[PDB]
Amino acid sequence: MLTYGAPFNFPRWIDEHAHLLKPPVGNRQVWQDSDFIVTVVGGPNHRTDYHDDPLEEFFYQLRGNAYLNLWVDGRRERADLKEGDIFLLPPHVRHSPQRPEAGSACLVIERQRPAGMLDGFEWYCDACGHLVHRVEVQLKSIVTDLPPLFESFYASEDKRRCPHCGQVHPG
Amino acid sequence: MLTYGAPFNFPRWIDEHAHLLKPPVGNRQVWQDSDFIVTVVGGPNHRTDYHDDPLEEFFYQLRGNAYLNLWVDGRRERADLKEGDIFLLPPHVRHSPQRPEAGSACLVIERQRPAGMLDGFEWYCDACGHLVHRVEVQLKSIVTDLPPLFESFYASEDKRRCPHCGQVHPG
Ligand SMILES: [Fe+2]
Ligand SMILES: [Fe+2]
Numbered sequence: 001m002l003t004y005g006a007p008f009n010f011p012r013w014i015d016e017h018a019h020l021l022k023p024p025v026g027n028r029q030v031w032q033d034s035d036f037i038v039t040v041v042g043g044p045n046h047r048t049d050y051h052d053d054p055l056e057e058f059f060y061q062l063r064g065n066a067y068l069n070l071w072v073d074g075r076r077e078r079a080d081l082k083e084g085d086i087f088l089l090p091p092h093v094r095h096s097p098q099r100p101e102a103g104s105a106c107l108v109i110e111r112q113r114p115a116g117m118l119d120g121f122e123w124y125c126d127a128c129g130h131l132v133h134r135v136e137v138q139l140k141s142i143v144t145d146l147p148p149l150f151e152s153f154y155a156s157e158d159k160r161r162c163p164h165c166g167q168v169h170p171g
Numbered sequence: 172m173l174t175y176g177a178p179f180n181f182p183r184w185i186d187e188h189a190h191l192l193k194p195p196v197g198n199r200q201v202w203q204d205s206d207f208i209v210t211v212v213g214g215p216n217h218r219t220d221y222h223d224d225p226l227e228e229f230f231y232q233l234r235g236n237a238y239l240n241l242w243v244d245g246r247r248e249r250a251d252l253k254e255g256d257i258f259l260l261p262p263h264v265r266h267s268p269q270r271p272e273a274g275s276a277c278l279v280i281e282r283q284r285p286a287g288m289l290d291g292f293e294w295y296c297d298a299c300g301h302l303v304h305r306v307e308v309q310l311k312s313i314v315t316d317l318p319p320l321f322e323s324f325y326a327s328e329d330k331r332r333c334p335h336c337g338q339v340h341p342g
Contacts, residue, residue, distance in 0.1 A: 001244060002264070007256035010231065031259050035227050036280070038259065056206050058280065060181065073172060085178035088202050088209065093173070109207070109229065109280060 064104025235275025
């Protein structure tokens, strides 16, 4: 059986879910209970966290532009997702998606994580560059298991305190 | 490190590889040695086989139209991939992609199969509908491990002989 339904027009599906791509949401998963996690991510968004995904992440910037703040070879690189770009992120490259444009839409595709394969969410210090805080999480909900993580980092000056220079991250 | 390179424009990449989407190829994998197998499939193509994929298969018909001959609930259903459609095929639904249009382009995304997870390739009889032949294969090469399977079915009248009505499949 076609568990996930029949083919349907993607542009128009993105149109009909525009208002849920705008904040306060941003995310919208296409099919539920599937192995491939297929999401459309709009803008504008608020992210200061770096994601440490134990599996690959496919990107296709369908509308508008966005960029990924990265940690590549110990440096703070930036990878731009201009409209029409596709990209395959290798496992565990830290990345912080910035989506400044309202009405943008990026197809993001990932894999359900097997039990014991944890996602990481880290913040780094603007001053000294050291790791400020890391939460590891057995991700079940690419859309709803992240904000409590975030809220609790923003709510805790201690979690935000850099252990190398003491500067409290802004959150 | 960005093992799979930097973002790049997908439309133009499809343009530059047009002539390899035309026969005798049809397939073109985007990145090598990745967990997500990301391919562009053009047309026109020749398929009489049904694929039995042990994992899910994501489709995004970027250009032109195509369709999937299916076996749903014991019947021969057809799922159309019109330009702009996306689709998520559940594991093990038998499917036979028909791509009649030259210049069409479909984004197909799959997963590297773990050792011991086999793909199936089956043919069915036009007359009686029974299974004519099935080859199971530990797929390493979504692009190059299939044609010898096919050639050997086309070359063997015995493999093509229906075991229920004796009609020899056309191949
Ligand atoms: Fe610091
Ligand atoms: Fe038959």
